Amino acid sequence: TLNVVSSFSVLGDIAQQVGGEHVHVDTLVGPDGDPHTFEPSPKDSALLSKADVVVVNGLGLEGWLDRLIKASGFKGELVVASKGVKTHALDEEGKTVTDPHAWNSAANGALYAQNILDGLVKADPEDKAALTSSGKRYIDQLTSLDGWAKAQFSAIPLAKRKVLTSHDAFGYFGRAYHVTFLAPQGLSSESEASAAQVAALIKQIKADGVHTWFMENQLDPRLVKQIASATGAQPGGELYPEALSKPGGVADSYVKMMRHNVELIANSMK
Ligand SMILES: [Zn+2]
């Protein structure tokens, strides 16, 4: 059985579904964990030294990766799950900043799963037929999930499709399924929201009639609650943008994470 380490919980689940009985997957960032503020520990280094495959997001999400690979002595296979995926970027200070959250489009999740399948087959060719069978089944589930998600938003009004959340993690979801996401913090929870941005969000919501706000499982909800209180926005619940729920929760897998987020956002539209 291949020993696989994922950088964070979402990728660990995709690797588990693709690999099935032929992989054992551990994750560095766990359920409800913030991937932006994470730094790895000696326990993480020890775990990676035993691994056959490491699965990461790329797109700048794991700044610590190279130093952890060096310290651990990891000599296995590195799989960048975002390879080939079309990225989005923000235009800031005359430069571009890549948005790493590409998996919140289920069509991109299917591309992630194909990259992970490719890496597992490369690392375990003895099981290539079995891995390809379970992988292609999962990929088909994800492209059909993408079609289901589009359908939940396509037959409802295009006007006023705006929600408020804690940070800018749903950009690819919003582009794929056509919903505008507002948030006081940007692409990363390493950066505090400026007074300028908080004031502008409150003004925008008051002026443009945003009705629903969400918290996120990996990020302190105090700030989004402050904006909601200043605007009278009503709660829509808890979204799971970049970490699975704990076991027994509403977002125990990537599929269930996507379904949960789609259901909650669509229901708030409505
Ligand atoms: Zn994020």
Author numbering: 23 to 292
From the study:
Recombinant, mature (residues 22-292) K. pneumoniae AJ218 ZniA was purified and crystallization was attempted using Mn(II) and Zn(II). Crystals of the SBP in the Zn(II)-bound state were obtained and the structure determined at 1.59 Å resolution. A single ZniA molecule was present in the asymmetric unit with a fold characteristic of proteins belonging to the cluster A-I subgroup of ABC transporter-associated SBPs (Scheepers et al., 2016). ZniA was comprised by two globular domains (henceforth the N- and C-terminal domains), with each domain consisting of a central four-stranded parallel β-sheet surrounded by four α-helices. The N- and C-terminal domains were linked by an interdomain α-helix and the protein bisected by a cleft in which the metal binds. The metal-binding site was located ~13 Å from the molecular surface of the protein and comprised by three Nϵ2 atoms, from His58 (β2α2 loop), His123 (β6α4 loop), and His189 (β7α6 loop), and one Oϵ2 atom, from Glu264 (β10α9 loop). These four residues bind a single Zn(II) ion via 4-coordinate geometry, with bond distances of 2.0 Å to 2.1 Å. In the Zn(II)-bound state of ZniA, the metal-binding site was occluded from bulk solvent. The structure of Zn(II)-bound ZniA was next compared with the closest phylogenetic match, AztC from P. denitrificans, which has structural similarities to both Zn(II) and Mn(II) binding SBPs. Structural superposition analyses revealed that the SBPs had similar global conformations, with a root mean square deviations of the Cα protein backbones (Cα-RMSD) of 1.3 Å.
